[PDB]
Ligand binder design. Structure first.
Ligand SMILES: NC(=O)OC[C@@H](O)C[C@H](NC(=O)[C@H]1NCCC[C@H]1O)C(=O)N[C@@H](Cc1c[nH]cn1)C(=O)N[C@H](C(=O)O)[C@H](O)c1c[nH]c(Cl)n1
Ligand SMILES: [K+]
Ligand SMILES: [Mg+2]
Ligand SMILES: [Mg+2]
Ligand SMILES: [Mg+2]
Ligand SMILES: [Mg+2]
Ligand SMILES: [Mg+2]
Ligand SMILES: [Mg+2]
Lengths: 112, 70
RNA sequence: GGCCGCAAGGUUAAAACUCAAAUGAAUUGACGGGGGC
RNA sequence: GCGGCCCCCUGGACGAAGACUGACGCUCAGGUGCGAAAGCGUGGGGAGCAAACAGGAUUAGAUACCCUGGUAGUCCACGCCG
């Protein structure tokens, strides 16, 4: 065989990669306690992920009696919703808690 | 202490030095600090609880918590 | 503030305020993603 | 601070025995020189490296450690910095 044969597979792989560059996994975590704009600092990182194309999974944690805080915790998730309303398409919303975590997933709007 | 004032309230936000911001049944917000036993009993307070608040007539802007609704 | 420097800066060198400490050597234990039998 | 070899110009130190000057000494505020590396100015040079920076990975995140590259710099001549 000849060396040139390697490239065509590489071109196909990069087509798969640009199909996969979104499918790279980036995770973001928050707590009800987080406040004072530290939330904005973490958003700066979410933005840099969406412009690349990845989905972002927003996790938020309650420990025990912090359930009283779920009423405010869902809003923190909503505060992401409004911030990305023009940046990210809503994909999955956590209708219930499991094992003390709410999981939310967003994917970037495919700008036309 | 003589002719004490007794009220309830709701804690709204955590502050450093275990002090807290509490809205009062009458619409006023006060700054509250913990008593000895619920400090000695390792009882921690989170946001949103109903708490019993002692006040003093000398100043009504700051009070002390004495009993939290679990 | 003064002097020096093309510039980075260097040199000389305070007070308000605040705490009842800060520190050095060594002792007996616990701990190490330190050794040895 | 100084390390291949050869030549040229040059400072200091130490030992032997003898001769000479005759206290000619010690220290030093101001003052004057030297002073690693990085850095600045003008002009050269550029193999190996390698801040910044580009790309690949790691992680929850990783503006890092890791991998492929790579500019200033590192080198030379004269000034500066101290
Ligand atoms: N959140 C996050 O930053 O990552 C998690 C972090 O824990 C990874 C962790 N990394 C390390 O120790 C660094 N040590 C210095 C060299 C590079 C790197 O290695 C680590 O576990 N390494 C493993 C290998 C690995 C698995 N996944 C990612 N890296 C490792 O081999 N460590 C070596 C060791 O235990 O001594 C050593 O660090 C090493 C040798 N060669 C290389 Cl490459 N790494
Ligand atoms: K004589
Ligand atoms: Mg010691
Ligand atoms: Mg000589
Ligand atoms: Mg004499
Ligand atoms: Mg002097
Ligand atoms: Mg140099
Ligand atoms: Mg490198």
């Amino acid at each position: 065989d000849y060396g040139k044969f390697l490239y065509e597979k590489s071109k196909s792989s990069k087509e798969q990669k640009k199909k996969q560059k979104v499918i790279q996994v980036k995770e973001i975590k928050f707590r009800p306690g987080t406040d004072e704009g530290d939330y904005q600092v973490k958003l700066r990182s979410l933005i840099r992920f969406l412009e690349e194309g990845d989905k972002a999974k927003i996790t938020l944690r309650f420990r025990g009696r912090e359930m009283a805080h779920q009423q405010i915790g869902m809003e923190v998730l909503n505060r992401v919703k409004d911030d990305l309303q023009e940046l990210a398409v809503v994909e999955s919303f956590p209708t219930k808690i499991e094992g003390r975590q709410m999981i939310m997933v967003l994917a970037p709007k495919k700008k036309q | 202490k003589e002719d004490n004032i007794e009220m309830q309230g709701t804690v709204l936000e955590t502050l450093p030095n275990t002090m807290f911001r509490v809205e009062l049944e009458n619409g006023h917000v006060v700054t509250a600090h913990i008593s000895g036993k619920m400090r000695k009993n390792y009882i921690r307070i989170l946001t949103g609880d109903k708490v019993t608040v002692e006040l003093t007539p000398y100043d009504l802007s700051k009070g002390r918590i004495v009993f939290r609704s679990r």
